[PDB]
Ligand binder design. Structure first.
Ligand code: MG
Ligand code: ZN
Length: 237
């Protein structure tokens, strides 16, 4: 089926595969502060541009309010002109009140415009803030980058050395045995070879029946789990 020396050979290889893989989180850890700075800087850059779209919409409102304020003031002017020419003096008190409503609407527009302009200003202040933060983050990225990339390069060279060792080991392995390993590794990755714990597959955790548990411990072969297909071994048999 396999044989214990073939099992040994695959255990050595599978450990070198795990080494190559488990160094991937290491590269990520090494980059964490640097990637954080770069990603925060990009997020703040987007926030500046978003705030610019909001300032644009607000500036459109300022302009719309400004047109109605122009209309309102023309109406005031027109009411006052009518008061000058008058007619009688029924309407002097009447027009004073017409004018008063129009004055109030013009006071509302002036307040609304001032309010919008205030919101615009707060956004421009926030933009200046973000811009300063972006520069601190660039300063940060530039500091971290020299070492981080050297550290990562040294780690890559280690994965190559590990792979070179794998080549040497694979070259000494019965091609059929290796391929049986690789076929399972396609889907199972680094849970390809597992130990028995309790009486269950160390990979799918479903209890192995008496016949199979005995077979793994007693016989000098290499057995696969009947539920998931993984290679199984007793840590010492
Ligand atoms: Mg008056
Ligand atoms: Zn299993």
């Amino acid at each position: 089926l396999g044989s214990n020396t073939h099992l040994k050979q695959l255990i050595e290889i599978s450990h070198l595969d795990k080494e190559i893989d488990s160094l991937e989180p290491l590269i990520r850890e090494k980059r964490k502060d640097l990637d954080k700075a770069l990603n925060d800087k990009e997020a703040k850059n987007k926030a500046i541009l978003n705030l610019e779209e909001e300032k644009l919409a607000l500036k459109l409102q300022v302009s719309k309010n400004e047109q109605t304020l122009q209309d309102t003031n023309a109406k005031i002017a027109s009411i006052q002109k009518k008061m000058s020419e008058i007619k009688s003096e029924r309407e002097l008190r009447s027009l004073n009140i017409e004018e008063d409503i129009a004055k109030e609407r013009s006071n509302q527009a002036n307040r609304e415009i001032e309010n919008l302009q205030n919101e615009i200003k707060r956004k421009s202040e926030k933009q200046e803030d973000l811009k300063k933060e972006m520069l601190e983050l660039e300063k940060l990225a530039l500091e971290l980058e020299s070492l981080v990339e050297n550290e990562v390069k040294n780690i890559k060279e280690t994965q190559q050395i590990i792979f070179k060792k794998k080549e040497d080991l694979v070259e000494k392995t019965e091609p059929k045995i290796y391929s049986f390993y690789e076929r399972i590794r396609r889907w199972a990755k680094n849970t390809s070879i597992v130990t028995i714990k309790k009486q269950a597959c160390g990979g799918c955790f479903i209890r192995l029946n008496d016949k199979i548990y005995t077979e793994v411990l007693t016989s000098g072969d290499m057995i696969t789990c009947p539920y998931c297909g993984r290679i199984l071994y007793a840590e010492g048999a």
